[PDB]
Each structure stands twice: as C-alpha cells, then as structure tokens.
Design a protein around this ligand. Structure first.
Ligand SMILES: Nc1ncnc2c1ncn2[C@@H]1O[C@H](COP(=O)(O)OP(=O)(O)O)[C@@H](O)[C@H]1O
Ligand SMILES: Nc1ncnc2c1ncn2[C@@H]1O[C@H](COP(=O)(O)OP(=O)(O)O)[C@@H](O)[C@H]1O
Ligand SMILES: Nc1ncnc2c1ncn2[C@@H]1O[C@H](COP(=O)(O)OP(=O)(O)O)[C@@H](O)[C@H]1O
Ligand SMILES: OC[C@H]1O[C@H](O)[C@H](O)[C@@H]1O
Ligand SMILES: [Cs+]
Ligand SMILES: [Cs+]
Lengths: 306, 306
C-alpha cells in the first residue's frame, strides 16, 4: 500500500514555438514542435516518484499511442500505475501550447481522457486512498472524482493535500476534507476572493481556508517563496533564487517534493524548504515533466546552496 | 509521365475544436482532438487526384508512423507518389489547428520533414516536371525547391500554377516563371503590398503580378469567390455559397480542381467555376484532406447549381 497516492490529470503537451501570438486567418510558421508528457497529476506524481516517494497514481489516459506509452513510462519512474486507467477510443488529454516569442503564451487544453476520471472511475482506487498516509490531488480532472477521493481519505485518517490547480472554485465539502492546501496566488484568490498582496492578505486568505476546515495552508508566491499558516500561525518561508525560464511544472514539482518530505517525517517547515529546492530546479528547465528534478538533483542543489 | 505535377507539403494536422479563438493570457478549452491528413501540397494533389487529374506528387514525409502511412494513402487517391520522399529521423510536418464553430481556423505549421524538399532533393523529379503540362505548387516547402521546379517547367512547355500560400514574399525569378498565381487576400497583399478589398484593388494587385510576368492571376476571396485577370482585363467570378464547417483546405481544393479543369481543356472561366464547386463542397466538411470532394460530387454539385 503506497504511502502516497497522487490523483490527477495526464496531458500530452504539444508545444510549438511561434513568432507571433496565433490569430485566425493565414497559416503561421511555427518551430521546435515537441510532444512533452504533461498534466498536473502526472507532473506531481512524477515529482514525488523522482523524490523517491512511495507513490501510487490515480489517473485517466487515452488509448492513443501516447496514453499507452506514458502509462509504461510512469512505471519506469517508480509510480504505482495500478490506478491509471486507459480510456477506450479517447485521445489522451492534450495541451496545445504555443509559446510566443513575444512572450505571451497560447494555451489550448482539451480534457479528453481526463474527463473520464469520475467518482465512479476511482472506485477501485478507494482502498489505496484509505491505506495511504497522504493523498495528493489537483484540479485538472472532474471534481466528483476529486471530492470522492478526499471524502474516502478523511474517514481513513489519510492526510489530504490539495493543489487547487488549475484555478477554480471549490465546495466547502471538499475544502473541509483538505488537511493541507497549496494554492498559488491566483488560486487562493479564486478560492477565497481574498487577493494576496502581502503577508496580511496571505494570512487572511489562509485564515479563510482555515475556516473552511483546512489546518495547514501554504500559498505559493512565485519567486516570493511560500506563505505557511498552521492553525492561524503564519509565516513566510522564502524559496530559492534561480534564473526562471519556464515555470510550467514549478507548482507541480513543489507539491510532489513537499509531500515527499513530510512522508520522510520532516518538520513541515523543513519539508517546505525542501520542496522550494525541487521547484526551483524545475523553473530553470523547459517543459512539464522534462523539467522535474530527481531527489539526487535536489540534494545536489541543496548542497550547492550550502 | 503525369500531365499534372503537384509539388508541396505534407502535414499531420493536430486539430482541436474550440468555442472561440484564444486570448493571449488565457487558457482555452478545446475538444474533438484529431490528427488529420493535411498540408497544402498534399491537399491540392489529393484535390487534383480526386478531380481525376493525371497527377504526380513531389513531397517529403517523415519516418514517423504518420508519414509512412499518409504517403501510402496518397496512392489510394490515384496520386503518383514516386516523388514523395520519406525523410529519416524527422517527424512529418505538423499543423496545430484550432477550428471554431464559424468554420474559421488558426493554423500553426512546423515544417519538419517538409524542410527536406530542397532543390537538390527534387533533382530526380525534374523529368516529371518537364514532361508535365501542368506544375502546381504552394509555399510550405523550401523556396529553393519551389524555384527550381518553376524553371524546369518553363523550358519544356509546362504551365506553372503557383499557390502562394502560406503568405510570404517571393523573388521575381520565381514569379516571372509563374503562368498562373492564386493568392488569397492576405497573400496578394504580402506579394504586392496592395491590399485587396474590392474590384479595383483586386485589379491593382493583379496587374502588379502581371508586371511580374504572370499572364493569368486569380485572387481568391473566400466566400466572395475569386478575382480573375488576363493581362489587364480583370473580373470577379463568384463561387458557390455554403455554410462553413471548416475552411481548412478550401483554397487547396480550389487550386487542385482549377488546374485539373484547365488540364482537361475547360476554358479558363469553366475551370474556375469547376474549382469553385469543389472548394465550396470542401468548406462544408471538417479537416484538410478529409473534406476534399470526389469528381462525381463536384459534377453533381455543378448539375445542381448549374
Ligand atoms: N496555462 C498552462 N500552461 C502550461 N501548461 C498548462 C496550463 N494549464 C494547464 N497545463 C497543464 O498542466 C501542467 C503545467 O502546470 P501549470 O500550473 O499550468 O504551470 P503554471 O505555473 O504556468 O501555471 C502542464 O503539464 C500542462 O499539461
Ligand atoms: N521564479 C522562481 N524562482 C524560484 N522558485 C520558484 C519560482 N517560481 C516558482 N518557484 C517555486 O515553485 C513553487 C511553485 O509555486 P508557484 O510558482 O506559485 O506555482 P505555479 O508556478 O504553479 O503558479 C514555489 O513554491 C517555489 O518553490
Ligand atoms: N464560406 C465559403 N463558401 C463557399 N466557398 C468558399 C468559402 N470559403 C472559401 N471558399 C472557396 O475556397 C476558395 C478560396 O477560399 P479561401 O480564400 O481559402 O477562404 P478561407 O481562407 O476562408 O477558407 C474559393 O474558390 C471559394 O470557392
Ligand atoms: O491549407 C490547410 C493546410 O495548411 C496547413 O499546412 C495545414 O496542414 C492545413 O492542413
Ligand atoms: Cs518548467
Ligand atoms: Cs474543410
């Protein structure tokens, strides 16, 4: 029984660099086309697995070549893929990601196989959720699946970490089941209404989540580190200073590394700093999973930062 | 030896249906992810083939499963794929395509294997070009290769029809060997500077190209049909009005049909009218080659319309 169970999405990132932002009409010449394994659930389970967590993964992929292959690849990564279903006659979820040389990114996502991860779909996964010490989830799969998983986890005294990404609002009923939540600045706002300008707001944002029943709130702040509140007692834990070139799986990495630290009986504060280190590395590399570091790369990183 | 030689591109079309077109800093949600036989070169060769032209295709495909597979498919449409090269360790040209409800599309292409259709690369194809009476090309393959073809055509009584798509500027050495050019409105603008907004501007653009050596100009105007000019004598030839499902390959289908009609001794005006019918049927259907009509379909449509 995996001590960590990650539930979440799988995309194929079709990345293309384009000179201008895409507009309808004339065929625009792109370049450096790649298909990168992505998806917030996949990226986080890959994060944890690469941080050597005892991790199983609940997800829905397609029966295209990509879905068939990425499942095998997860195995190679050390992820228990028992909970990874292949959806008949569905492509795998895809992100059509056009990186514009003029900075501004064009993103077109289609759920595809991901829309299939329903509360009923995860039924055989429930037991793995009960036996886990931690359940990690995001929001790139249907809500009923996410909610069903958290509920199962509360009664089993499994700890529930929710990375509320991508940004979307959530019912009290799910928040109440979440032991630890890790929104970024955008997502805390969406979830609370409270926009996070500084410590005061971050703490109000946090307290709003504490009142939704979430003991621990971690608001990731981009380069500003993290705002950690545990039972009202808040504090900013800063991250590392790196030349950021792509932050695509940054948040995915942080959550994977964070939960792996806690499973190693790290104090929360230390687990967090550890996760900072992993995510920092990732923000320095291109693409989703292509940027997610190993435990070795992290220890190496931490050593080099003294 | 084929009477018509089409030289141009092959792409896998990665196609998403979108509610609308994406705003710069925002995540579009798409659907019906599909990978579709495409590329202007293939589209027009497929179009001429289906119009029962005697057509050989000069193109480059990759050695991925897609390129191997599509080249075979070309045979099934009666295309002589002798000149269709398989390029090792290169994926096939791709297009990332979003099609909205309106039938509008944004297309981003990645050349990939198409970048291998060089002048040197088409050396074995020069005989087919000389022995043809018609050479039809577009612009998704290297310019040096397009140029070379146009030149070998003129030495051996071979009419050149250039379809200057996607929009880019062309050297005069190319244009003066073009017997008949078929820009859309964006391309006409890019080629002459003269935006085409009406009858007069349509003629300004056209005579610009006549002073580039091109005897016959055809400016396509979407649903407004085309503008036809034979040495300073322009006129608008209306297309047929259809509801647009997807307009990906309307112009490709038009070019394919047009050249075939001409080839089969339809007077210039009849060939255009013929081509209009093919293209109008095509904009009613989804995806690139998936939408290209049969000859019987076009006759039927022509018998209906009339
Ligand atoms: N706007 C987006 N840009 C890039 N990837 C996205 C986006 N939205 C969802 N994804 C999916 O989730 C993963 C990236 O995480 P994300 O949180 O979007 O990064 P960011 O820090 O830019 O918000 C990718 O693998 C991709 O498949
Ligand atoms: N520019 C950066 N420099 C260093 N670390 C970063 C940077 N951006 C993100 N991080 C790290 O990535 C983690 C993810 O947080 P955040 O960037 O808010 O998520 P997301 O990028 O998904 O919005 C942060 O807690 C931090 O550890
Ligand atoms: N909405 C439409 N209805 C009918 N025919 C069309 C339509 N759009 C394009 N065509 C046909 O395709 C040819 C060129 O169209 P094009 O300029 O490429 O339009 P678009 O770029 O919007 O597809 C014309 O011959 C015309 O017959
Ligand atoms: O003309 C439409 C075609 O142009 C682009 O090259 C795409 O592949 C698409 O299929
Ligand atoms: Cs990254
Ligand atoms: Cs079409």
């Amino acid at each position: 029984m995996n001590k960590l169970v990650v539930l979440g999405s799988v995309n194929a990132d079709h990345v293309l660099q384009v000179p201008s932002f895409p507009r309808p009409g004339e065929t625009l010449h792109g370049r450096n086309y790649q298909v990168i394994p992505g998806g917030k659930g996949a990226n986080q389970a890959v994060a944890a697995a690469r941080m050597q967590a005892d991790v199983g993964f609940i997800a829905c992929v397609g029966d295209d070549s990509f879905g068939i292959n990425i499942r095998e690849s997860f195995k190679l990564d050390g992820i228990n893929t028992a909970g990874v279903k292949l959806q008949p006659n569905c492509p795998t979820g895809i992100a059509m990601i056009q990186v514009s040389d003029s900075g501004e990114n064009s993103i077109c996502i289609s759920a595809e196989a991901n829309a299939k991860l329903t509360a009923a779909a995860i039924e055989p996964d429930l037991a793995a959720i009960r036996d886990a010490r931690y359940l990690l989830m995001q929001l790139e799969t249907p809500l009923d699946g996410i909610l069903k998983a958290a509920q199962e986890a509360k009664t089993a005294k499994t700890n529930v970490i929710l990375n509320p990404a991508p940004a979307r609002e959530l019912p009290d009923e799910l928040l109440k089941c979440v032991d630890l939540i890790t929104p970024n600045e955008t997502e805390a706002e969406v979830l609370t209404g409270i926009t996070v300008y500084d410590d005061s707001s971050a703490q109000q944002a946090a307290d709003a989540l504490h009142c939704k029943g979430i003991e621990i709130v971690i608001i990731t702040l981009g380069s500003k580190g993290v705002w950690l509140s545990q039972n009202g007692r808040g504090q900013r834990i800063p991250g590392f200073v790196v030349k950021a070139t792509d932050t695509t799986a940054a948040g995915d990495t942080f959550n994977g590394a964070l939960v792996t630290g806690l499973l190693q009986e790290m104090p929360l504060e230390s687990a967090i700093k550890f996760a900072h280190a992993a995510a920092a590395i990732s923000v320095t590399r291109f693409g989703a999973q292509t940027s997610i570091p190993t435990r070795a790369e992290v220890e190496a990183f931490l050593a080099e930062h003294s």
